[PDB]
Amino acid sequence: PFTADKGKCGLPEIFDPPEELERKVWELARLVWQSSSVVFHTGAGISTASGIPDFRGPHGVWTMEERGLAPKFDTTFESARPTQTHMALVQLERVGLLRFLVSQNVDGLHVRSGFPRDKLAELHGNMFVEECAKCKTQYVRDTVVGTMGLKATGRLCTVACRGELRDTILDWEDSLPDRDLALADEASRNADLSITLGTSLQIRPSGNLPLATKRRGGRLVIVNLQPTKHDRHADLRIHGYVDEVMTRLMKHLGLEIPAWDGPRVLERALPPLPRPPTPKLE
Numbered sequence: 574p575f576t577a578d579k580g581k582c583g584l585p586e587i588f589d590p591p592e593e594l595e596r597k598v599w600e601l602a603r604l605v606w607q608s609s610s611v612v613f614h615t616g617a618g619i620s621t622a623s624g625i626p627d628f629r630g631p632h633g634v635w636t637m638e639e640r641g642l643a644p645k646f647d648t649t650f651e652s653a654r655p656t657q658t659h660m661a662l663v664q665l666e667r668v669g670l671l672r673f674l675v676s677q678n679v680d681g682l683h684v685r686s687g688f689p690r691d692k693l694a695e696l697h698g699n700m701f702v703e704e705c706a707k708c709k710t711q712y713v714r715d716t717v718v719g720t721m722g723l724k725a726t727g728r729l730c731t732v733a734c735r736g737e738l739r740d741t742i743l744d745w746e747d748s749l750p751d752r753d754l755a756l757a758d759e760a761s762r763n764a765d766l767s768i769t770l771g772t773s774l775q776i777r778p779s780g781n782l783p784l785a786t787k788r789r790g791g792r793l794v795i796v797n798l799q800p801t802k803h804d805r806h807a808d809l810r811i812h813g814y815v816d817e818v819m820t821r822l823m824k825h826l827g828l829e830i831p832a833w834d835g836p837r838v839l840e841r842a843l844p845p846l847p848r849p850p851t852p853k854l855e
């Protein structure tokens with residue numbers, strides 16, 4: 574907890590020059606069109622444009638603690654709005670272009686964005702979510718659950734139970750939720766495309782899951798400003814702001830980014846909405 578291996582921190586940013594970035598995002602477009610089963614892996618870099626610092630970016634929580642400095646929040650977790658990227662992922666699920674979402678993020682914004690929870694693996698848990706020890710029932714709260722470390726919150730279950738409600742925030746020692754990880758693992762193995770967005774892929778097993786797509790001919794796309802553990806294993810690396818990449822990608826796919834109505838929870842994915850017909854590729 575003090576001795577924890579926090580990996581490599583504050584590595585330089587890479588910026589793809591505009592001409593190469595525009596070329597690269599058209600190539601991502603291409604792969605999304607060709608892929609039967611697209612899995613997105615997210616990490617803290619997709620929430621930096623909403624005021625949430627990352628962990629190992631130039632001004633990340635781990636990077637600044639190393640320099641003796643504080644990370645800076647420009648919002649509360651409660652007041653944070655899903656980014657363009659968050660709302661791009663909503664639409665990509667709605668139009669059947671996204672099979673599964675695997676997130677390392679505890680910021681709760683995927684759930685609040687209105688993304689369906691039966692297609693989301695939250696591998697490290699969710700600040701707004703408590704679980705019943707007795708019945709395992711989950712509650713999505715409008716305020717962050719005040720504890721971290723799978724501790725008692727002080728609230729009790731209301732299943733037509735009085736069981737102890739606890740936070741879902743894994744400490745260094747805790748192993749990942751078996752259900753979320755199982756679903757994340759099967760999602761990643763079966764995918765023919767895994768796109769990573771704003772993650773450094775340094776944490777096991779989260780950061781290895783995208784590599785599982787590379788078994789049986791799957792493609793891997795890494796979107797990240799800094800290098801990542803598995804940069805070598807990517808078919809495509811895009812070095813740019815994830816909001817820029819996704820807004821260009823969406824536009825290539827002929828998909829608008831939907832309005833965020835404020836905090837909503839959707840439990841269950843709907844049948845795909847209509848989407849434009851696919852281009853001739855070859």
Ligand SMILES: Nc1ncnc2c1ncn2[C@@H]1O[C@H](COP(=O)(O)OP(=O)(O)OC[C@H]2O[C@H](O)[C@H](O)[C@@H]2O)[C@@H](O)[C@H]1O
Pocket residue numbers: 615616617618619621622627628629630633677678679697770771772773774775776796797798799800813814815816
């Ligand atoms: N707008 C942006 N566009 C693109 N890349 C970005 C942006 N902002 C940040 N990045 C990149 O995004 C990356 C963020 O990577 P890391 O900081 O390691 O976050 P994780 O999700 O991978 O952390 C894993 C776990 O470690 C913790 O202990 C927790 O348990 C976490 O769940 C950086 O490389 C930035 O260059």
Ligand SMILES: NC(=O)c1cccc(N)c1
Pocket residue numbers: 616617620625626627628634644677678679680681
């Ligand atoms: N984006 C996130 O999940 C998160 C959560 C806590 C702290 C930080 N820096 C980021």
Ligand SMILES: [Cl-]
Pocket residue numbers: 721722742743744
């Ligand atoms: Cl913690």
Ligand SMILES: [Zn+2]
Pocket residue numbers: 705706707708709710730731732734735736
């Ligand atoms: Zn209960």
